[PDB]
């Protein structure tokens, strides 16, 4: 799980919501009378109702994930 | 897990929001009458009704995250 | 788990919420008569209505976060 | 878990909340008639009505975290 | 757990807020009838109705943070 | 848990809280009934209406946490 | 306009009304640079969102209503 | 306009209503930059959001009404 | 304009109204930049959120209403 | 205008309003650089947001109104 | 104007009101730069946010009432 | 204007008000350069956040009202 980034040198952004009784829920979990359950989250989760991304990389970005399970 | 960033050297972002009654759950867990269970959460959870992300990067960036989950 | 950021040398950001009656959760447990539960957060939660990120990484930036879950 | 950050040398920001009624829960455990369970933050857990980052970083900024759970 | 920083070296930023019965809540643990919990907070919490962060990090900035859960 | 600082050498800031009956719960722990239970805070738990943070680091910045919880 | 009534001598009534964001107008007029106009109401105007009317009349009712309008 | 009642001699009644942010307007007249205008009302002008009559006439009832207009 | 009544001789009455935000107009004028108007009222203006008449008349009841308008 | 009422001879009422925020008004006028205006109220305005009448008339009961408008 | 009344021989009302922040306008009449207006009231104005009438008239009742308006 | 009572001869009523933050006008009048204007009051205003009446009449009740306004 290695992440590097480097940078050397020698607009309108416009985003409108105009909502109206917005629900959300971005990670939930429901468990009724169960044994066993794992809920891994390990990346990137996004949740809206209006969900902008803009210009996210103009230089150095670089996301390193990594998620593990062992279970002997 | 390593993370590593290096910047050598040698506009209008408009965000609007007009909403009414807004409910918002980002990271909700219910048990009810349950054993055993596991809510891991190692990376991004982003949760909105207007979730903007303007320019998030423009220098030197690395998010370098992991889990690890063993169960012997 | 290590975390490095340098830097050498040698506009309007608008946000704009108008709501009413909102009603906002981050991280929530409901527990009621289970045995065994582990809620475990070791990232980045973000919880919102009007959830805005403008110019977040301009220079030097990064985040190395970790989890680890060992039972045995 | 080591941070390390170094800078070497040789606008208008607005926020507008008008909310009416506003219900906020960062982080909440609700546990009734249970046995065990565990509660662990490490993160970052960010909640808000109007939840906005400008300009997080410009220099050099490196935030490390780290968790671990051990059972045995 | 080491951190660092170091700098060597040889605008308007307006928040409004005008809201109306406001209740927050940011840390609140309820336990009844049980017999074992831990809430363990080792991170960073942010609950607002308004939560601004603007111009965060400008210089040397590095927050180095862990937890540990061992049980034998 | 090491922090160190050193910083070698050879605008306007407003925030406007208009609200009415607000009812701030920083950290609260509710026990009823129960037999065993820890409350351990060891990072940065920041709650309010009008959660502002303007140009928090502009120097030499570095804050050093960490938990420790042993149970043999 | 004559109206008589006489009467000589020798239950469950249930109403549910569960709304939200009721909008009611009975009697509106609207002019803008006009020259003449008559609004004349001289009998029963009924208006609701849940306009209910039970057992009205079980005894001696009588309603005499009348309008006149002379332009000479 | 001659009314009369006589009247000579030799259960559960429920309603229920449970609206939210209900805005009522009865009798309104909007002039602008007119001239003559006549609003009349000899009758009856009932409005609500939960409207109930219930057993209105059980003995004598008689309503004599009347409305006139002259304009020579 | 005459009215009589004579009465010659020889349960549960619920209403609940569970309401938010109610705003009631029972009579409204506006006049603008106009130059003659009349408003006459002369019978009954019942005007509500929840407007109940329950068992109004079980006797002599006898309304006796009259309105007159002359131009000459 | 004559109104006359005689008599001779030879339960539970519940009402209930809980509501929140409630603005009343029951007879309002609004003049602005007008002429000539007139405001003639000779009957009965009832305004509320619970406008209940329980049992209005159960004897002799005989209301007798009147109104006039001249302009010669 | 002859009102007359005469009477010869020979339970629980609970109202129950429980609001929070009510503004209530019986009468009202705002003039701005006009010329000539009249408020002419001659009859009954109730108003109210719990406008309750219980067992009004049980016996002997009569109201007369009467407007006049003369402009020669 | 004659008025008239005569009466010849040969339980719980609970009114429950728990509010907060009541504002009350009864009568008002508004007046900014202006020329002529005339309030006139001659029958009954009723203002109130609580307004109830019970068991008004129960015996020999009779009111006269009148209103006279000539302008030659």
Do not use: M, P, R
Not at 5 to 33: D, F, I, N, R
Not at 58 to 68: C, F, K, L
């Amino acid at each position: 799980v290695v992440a590097a980034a480097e940078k050397t040198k020698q607009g309108v952004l416009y985003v409108g919501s105009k909502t109206k009784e917005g629900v959300v829920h971005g990670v939930a979990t429901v468990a009724e009378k169960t044994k066993e359950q794992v809920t891994n989250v390990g990346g990137a989760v996004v949740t809206g109702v209006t969900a902008v991304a803009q210009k996210t990389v103009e230089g150095a970005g670089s996301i390193a994930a990594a998620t593990g399970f062992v279970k002997k």
